[PDB]
Amino acid sequence: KNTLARRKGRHMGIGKRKGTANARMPEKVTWMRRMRILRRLLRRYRESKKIDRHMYHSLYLK
RNA sequence: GUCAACAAGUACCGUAAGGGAAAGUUGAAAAGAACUUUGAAGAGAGAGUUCAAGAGGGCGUGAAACCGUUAAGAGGUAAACG
RNA sequence: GUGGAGGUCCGUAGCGGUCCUGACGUGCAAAUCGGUCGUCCGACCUGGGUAUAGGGGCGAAAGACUAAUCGAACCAUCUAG
RNA sequence: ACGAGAACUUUGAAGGCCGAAGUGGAGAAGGGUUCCAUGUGAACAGCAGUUGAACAUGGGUCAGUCGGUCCUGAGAGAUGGGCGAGCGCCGUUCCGAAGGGACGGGCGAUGGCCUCCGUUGCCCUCGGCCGAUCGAAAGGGAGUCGGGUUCAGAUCCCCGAAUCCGGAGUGGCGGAGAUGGGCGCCGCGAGGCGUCCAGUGCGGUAACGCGACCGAUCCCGGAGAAGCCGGCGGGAGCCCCGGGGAGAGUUCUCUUUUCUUUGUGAAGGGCAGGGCGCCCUGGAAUGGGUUCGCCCCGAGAGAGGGGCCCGUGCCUUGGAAAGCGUCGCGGUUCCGGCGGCGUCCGGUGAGCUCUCGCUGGCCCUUGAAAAUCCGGGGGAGAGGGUGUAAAUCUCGCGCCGGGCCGUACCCAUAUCCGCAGCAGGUCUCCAAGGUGAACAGCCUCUGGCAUGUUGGAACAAUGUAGGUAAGGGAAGUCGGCAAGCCGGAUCCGUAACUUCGGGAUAAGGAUUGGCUCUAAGGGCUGGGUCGGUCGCGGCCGGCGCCUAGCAGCCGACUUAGAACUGGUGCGGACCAGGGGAAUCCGACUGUUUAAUUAAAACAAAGCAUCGCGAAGGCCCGCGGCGGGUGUUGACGCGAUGUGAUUUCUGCCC
RNA sequence: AAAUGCCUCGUCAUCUAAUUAGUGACGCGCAUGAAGGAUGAACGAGAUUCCCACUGUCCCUACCUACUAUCCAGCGAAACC
RNA sequence: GUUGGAUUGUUCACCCACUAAUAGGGAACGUGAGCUGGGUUUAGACCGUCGUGAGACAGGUUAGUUUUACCCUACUGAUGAUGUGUUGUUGCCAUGGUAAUCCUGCUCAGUACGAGAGGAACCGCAGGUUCAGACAUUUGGUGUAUGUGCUUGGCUGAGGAGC
RNA sequence: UCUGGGUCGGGGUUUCGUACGUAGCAGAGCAGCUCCCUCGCUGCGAUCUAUUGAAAGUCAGCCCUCGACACAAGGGUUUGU
Ligand SMILES: O=C(c1ccc(-n2nnc3cccnc32)cc1)N(c1ncccc1Cl)[C@@H]1CCCNC1
Ligand SMILES: [Mg+2]
Ligand SMILES: [Mg+2]
Ligand SMILES: [Mg+2]
Ligand SMILES: [Mg+2]
Ligand SMILES: [Mg+2]
Ligand SMILES: [Mg+2]
Ligand SMILES: [Mg+2]
Ligand SMILES: [Mg+2]
Ligand SMILES: [Mg+2]
Ligand SMILES: [Mg+2]
Ligand SMILES: [Mg+2]
Ligand SMILES: [Mg+2]
Ligand SMILES: [Mg+2]
Ligand SMILES: [Mg+2]
Ligand SMILES: [Mg+2]
Ligand SMILES: [Mg+2]
Ligand SMILES: [Mg+2]
Ligand SMILES: [Mg+2]
Ligand SMILES: [Mg+2]
Ligand SMILES: [Mg+2]
Ligand SMILES: [Mg+2]
Ligand SMILES: [Mg+2]
Ligand SMILES: [Mg+2]
Ligand SMILES: [Mg+2]
Ligand SMILES: [Mg+2]
Ligand SMILES: [Mg+2]
Ligand SMILES: [Mg+2]
Ligand SMILES: [Mg+2]
Ligand SMILES: [Mg+2]
Ligand SMILES: [Mg+2]
Ligand SMILES: [Mg+2]
Ligand SMILES: [Mg+2]
Ligand SMILES: [Mg+2]
Ligand SMILES: [Mg+2]
Ligand SMILES: [Mg+2]
Ligand SMILES: [Mg+2]
Ligand SMILES: [Mg+2]
Ligand SMILES: [Mg+2]
Ligand SMILES: [Mg+2]
Ligand SMILES: [Mg+2]
Ligand SMILES: [Mg+2]
Ligand SMILES: [Mg+2]
Ligand SMILES: [Mg+2]
Ligand SMILES: [Mg+2]
Ligand SMILES: [Mg+2]
Hints:
The chain has helices spanning about 5, 20-25, 25-45, 55-60. The protein is mostly helical. Helix 3 runs antiparallel to helix 4 (about 55-60). About 0% of the residues are buried. Bound molecules: the ligand O=C(c1ccc(-n2nnc3cccnc32)cc1)N(c1ncccc1Cl)[C@@H]1CCCNC1 and magnesium ion (MG) (45 copies). The chain binds 6 RNA strands through helix 1, helix 2, helix 3 and helix 4. GO terms for molecular function: RNA binding; structural constituent of ribosome. It comes from Homo sapiens (Human). This is Large ribosomal subunit protein eL19. Its main location: cytoplasm.
């Protein structure tokens, strides 16, 4: 019943956290997660012919 | 007296080289205390063996230091002594 | 932004041993214990197997260590020096 | 309860501690019977014991597959040789006539199912594991798993599934090799009979596949056989989250509740999944593909299509007959009894621990060897004359064997060492829930234990360990010694100085609870317009514009903001830097007197000098032209001083 | 006037109410000095001086807790003489 | 009675401040099984001077284990012992110990005294210092009454009640 | 003994700060029910308010009880002019 209340947001707080925000969730993992989301929507638009091979490749570097 | 009169180069010690003790005696004969009784037993009390258990299984004799007990005497200049 | 280097830093287990000149000091112990401390990817820590033996060994060097023994180990003898 | 006797034994109940880096479960060393029963109750276990690791009496360790055994490593070590008065010791390929083998060739005596054909003697050919031998219970090293079982043993016994190696003269059976063509009569023909010629397998463009699929001396190769660290990814085990059961717990009220439990070995066969600098088609600039990071491409990208490897996961055989959970019924009541029922369906992840893989980083550091095994190249040779044939077979099945030694238990606040049941020391494997960054500390579950060699009663001094303290705030003291303060995290803000890296968590400040909300951050599905119209579903196409994306379902965790709210409390315990200004010294990290000195000492990088071109330099050695450096060669070895950088290093021979 | 300066508590400045301390200067320096001299970040369980915060370190002691001592049952040493 | 401090290991010294005063000594240079370990101060190390050197320095610097009482006595407390028949109650005092101390203010008096500047004292009163003996109404400390609230992490299915 | 002193209980004192339940048209808000409602009525919800200076403790070394309940002439060892 505390995991039920933590997932609603309670007890999380700024005085209930004791490790650094990078230790609490690594920003490499945030970057690694975000890159995979934005790279597979680009591969999915290319094979669905929304974007061509040229708009894909310039977007892929942004 | 050989370290060793005895289950002695033994037990034990040290990684090893090596080091290295202690310990003899019931009685003539086991006759090594049957039996009864108290105790859970060890231990006792009787009884018995023997010349002897003031010889009872590390037991011949059994000193002293030291200790217990009884008896007698004494005790404020620590005892002791001439 | 990503990336993740370093005899890098705080800090575990380990390894070590600073201070209290704390406890102990006929001890739990012929060197221990408590707290605080040093280091903690490196000249790191460790098991087993090997090599080096006494005026010799081995030493990031204190004359340190070489079986509780070290400015020359231990054992027996010369020796009742 | 037993007992003469209970603070200490055992059983139950409670209350607690270790708290998965255990006070848990197993081992290596080392011990040596301590293991396990029963009995005792003297001694010993520093109180006591009805207890014991004591005493007595018995019992207990089962192997082709687990180790040893085998292999080589650092190294040890004989022989030849050399030295040595000598016991010997030097040396390990060096001052050696160091192969004792081999299919075959051939001469053979011939013993023989003497047709022969296994043996054998010499000859011919062939030939460097060029160093005997030893060295690992953590290296290398074929092949065993599940279930049951004892007072004490089990991967060893039993039951059941396997499996490697070795062998089989009298070959044990299949299959492969290997049974085709041409011609000529005959057969209406399907097929016979004759004759001639083949036949040491076949498929795929390819990578490669197929059950076998000749072949020696020799030769080339592979496996064995390789560091550390980082980052991802796959798979498992555990954890977790929804449900479905079976059984317990609570039930004063609430709780569709809380807990426990909810299997499939090896070896086969298949299929997911993972990897591939593997193949083929084709030819890329408006460069494209792509990872967290990279990286890749005319020496062939993207895209299509294949191939191989791994497959520890899932399915199947094993296999439910076993096990487990419940519920019952019996006796031989000390039976691997008997029966029912079940052993289900999902979801998550920067989780943890193993493992597999990919790809990087670092190195004046490049991270064993060998037994063993395999593949290829080569072709000496061998096989039979068209037969239900031969040599041969790394294919399937069958048959026989696997000896010797270890195997109990302890593995440590009581089995080991420390004179002892000694707070010391002593190498590893597994590792749950909560909090949290965390194998931190704290609390709990599994498992374990009885407070560490005595109890009782008191609450004096002095201690030892821990706390607090008005008002001052180092005045104490040789010295702020000791203690205290500080502390996490978020948001701000950070000087001098500097080798530009640092200083730095500088310093300094704010914030932190609970509750109720709010935003933001993803994943899987379906965008199909008219039946044009019959094999309530499709068969080929008129018939249409999601195209600024909708719609359904599902899913974690985290960040920011706001309202309310409390006696201003909020990192509430635990965890958890006091800071500043200077001077001296050593650059730093590292090291050091085990048991009074951790430092400014030693080390060190950098700098500088010296010797030496091998009959050499330095050094060992009783001795040998014996050793070490040296598997070396001046960018090297050897001998010294100083001690990073910066800046300098004067004069005297 | 340095970890090197006898004289020496050197002289002047600063720091304090007060400084044989510390820092900055000065220097015929008892007896500084160049592979060692002079520096300089970072680092240090190294030595030293002051400031801020903090405090029983003190003025000046007090009180509370655990284990002792203390008493009892059991057990029972040694140094020394 | 003879103090609180800076520097120094200091004894001494010197200075600041207070005070009625900040006198001098002794007791195994009183006192370490009382402490501390700052000076000296074994083994480490650095510098200067000396020495060919190992080393030395009555020179500077830094680091460096402080053991035992349970015996007899003394001392401090605690029982007790000998007498008087036993036993109790109420008392006496031999002897030994002995403790209080100093200063301000007011007043005297701005008087005596003195040219002036300055400037007392006794009586009296009001307080304080140092010491001594107590005590806890009060204020302060303590606080495990484990009193009563609050609160973190965990645990009993939650609530409640608790650990 | 005009008993007695104990153990509970009661009262006084005092310490802390308002218990549990229940109720509330108190509550930041959120979720629901719509024949309802004519702006409802069920939930969730820290906190608040009333019941409530409540609740809990209070001699063990606090005070006073005369309520309840028991128990108390019982033992053991010595002492003579
Ligand atoms: O334990 C002792 C200890 C003390 C005294 C003796 N003595 N002295 N005289 C003695 C006469 C007879 C017997 N013993 C005797 C023995 C040893 N320590 C110790 N203390 C100081 C110097 C040396 C040592 Cl070793 C240790 C060190 C570690 C920390 N704890 C203390
Ligand atoms: Mg006689
Ligand atoms: Mg006689
Ligand atoms: Mg005789
Ligand atoms: Mg005799
Ligand atoms: Mg005679
Ligand atoms: Mg006799
Ligand atoms: Mg007498
Ligand atoms: Mg000490
Ligand atoms: Mg002591
Ligand atoms: Mg102990
Ligand atoms: Mg020396
Ligand atoms: Mg000598
Ligand atoms: Mg003589
Ligand atoms: Mg604990
Ligand atoms: Mg075990
Ligand atoms: Mg164990
Ligand atoms: Mg005993
Ligand atoms: Mg046993
Ligand atoms: Mg061998
Ligand atoms: Mg075993
Ligand atoms: Mg023990
Ligand atoms: Mg205890
Ligand atoms: Mg106990
Ligand atoms: Mg205070
Ligand atoms: Mg001072
Ligand atoms: Mg002072
Ligand atoms: Mg300190
Ligand atoms: Mg700084
Ligand atoms: Mg250093
Ligand atoms: Mg030492
Ligand atoms: Mg030390
Ligand atoms: Mg030189
Ligand atoms: Mg000359
Ligand atoms: Mg200077
Ligand atoms: Mg000072
Ligand atoms: Mg100066
Ligand atoms: Mg000179
Ligand atoms: Mg020069
Ligand atoms: Mg003395
Ligand atoms: Mg002393
Ligand atoms: Mg000293
Ligand atoms: Mg010295
Ligand atoms: Mg010099
Ligand atoms: Mg000289
Ligand atoms: Mg509650």
